[PDB]
Structure formats: structure tokens, C-alpha cells
Design a protein around this ligand. Structure first.
Ligand SMILES: [Ca+2]
Ligand SMILES: [Ca+2]
Length: 161
């Protein structure tokens, strides 16, 4: 069901981006065979802005090099590329979210209180009323303590996963 994975890897990407990826890829494919040595996988990934740990690179080669060819074809390469891209993106957002919280928690007590919540909303310039701010608090405040912890904040920001 790799061919399934392969088809889903291509659908995630736009054709121009896929061709750009190939253009980089083809730089390490001499014989014009459509595959590179798994030795160059990390390199190509990195030039195209992915940052796989050595351990994840080792897992991938392991997955693709089941026959001992010592090579990975462009299709299994887009598959690995999308896995990496998703793994990386998610990661970025976790971090920005963390930053966000630290910024919103103006007294750094570990919670966003109704006063802090109001000030940040009101600063958007949006025409939100008190009733509106207190509605978002109740809805997000899961243990009914009147404040939002990091835990409720993630739930708040990311909705229903
Ligand atoms: Ca606070
Ligand atoms: Ca709470």
C-alpha cells in the first residue's frame, strides 16, 4: 500500500513544488535512473529545508532499502518528504503556541485570567464585548477555575483534533 502512500504523497503537493523537488533530486541521479543512493537522502532533504534527525534517516533507509540496492526512488522520496514536512510543521505550531501562551500570560503565573484574556482580545481592535470575552472563557475553562492553563489554551486554540 506504498503506491497508495505514494499517490497520497503527490496529492499533498502542488505539481510545481514536486518538479522543484525532482530538479534537486536529479542532481544526485547520474545514470538518470530516477533514484539516488540512500547515502545522499539526508543531503537532498536538507537542501529542500527538512531536518530529519540521523535516527529518523536511519529508520527511513531501513524502510526503503528492503532489497539492498542502496537506493531510493523519487516516489518513495516524495513519501518521506511529506512525512517529514508534516512532522516538522506540527512541531513549529506547538512552539509558536507555547510562545503565544507566555506572551498572553502577562504576569507569568501560568494562567490566562479573565483580565488578561480581555486585554489581549480588546487589543485586536475587534469589536468584542465583555459578554463575548466571558463566553470564550467559560467555554475554554474546563476545570471551572476561572482561568486558562496551557492545557486548556491548546484545546482552546486547536479545537477538536
Ligand atoms: Ca496570568
Ligand atoms: Ca481552568
Amino acid at each position: 500500500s506504498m503506491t497508495d502512500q505514494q499517490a497520497e504523497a503527490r496529492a499533498f503537493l502542488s505539481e510545481e513544488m514536486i518538479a522543484e523537488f525532482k530538479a534537486a533530486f536529479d542532481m544526485f541521479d547520474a545514470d538518470g535512473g530516477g533514484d539516488i543512493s540512500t547515502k545522499e537522502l539526508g543531503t537532498v532533504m536538507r537542501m529542500l529545508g527538512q531536518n530529519p534527525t540521523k535516527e529518523e534517516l536511519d529508520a527511513i533507509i531501513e524502510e526503503v532499502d528492503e532489497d539492498g540496492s542502496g537506493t531510493i526512488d523519487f516516489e518513495e522520496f516524495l513519501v518521506m518528504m511529506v512525512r517529514q514536512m508534516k512532522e516538522d510543521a506540527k512541531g513549529k505550531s506547538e512552539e509558536e503556541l507555547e510562545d503565544c501562551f507566555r506572551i498572553f500570560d502577562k504576569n507569568a503565573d501560568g494562567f490566562i485570567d479573565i483580565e488578561e484574556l480581555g486585554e489581549i482580545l480588546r487589543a485586536t481592535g475587534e469589536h468584542v464585548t465583555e459578554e463575548d470575552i466571558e463566553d470564550l472563557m467559560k467555554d475554554s475553562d474546563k476545570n471551572n477555575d476561572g482561568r486558562i492553563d496551557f492545557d486548556e489554551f491548546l484545546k482552546m486554540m486547536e479545537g477538536v483534533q
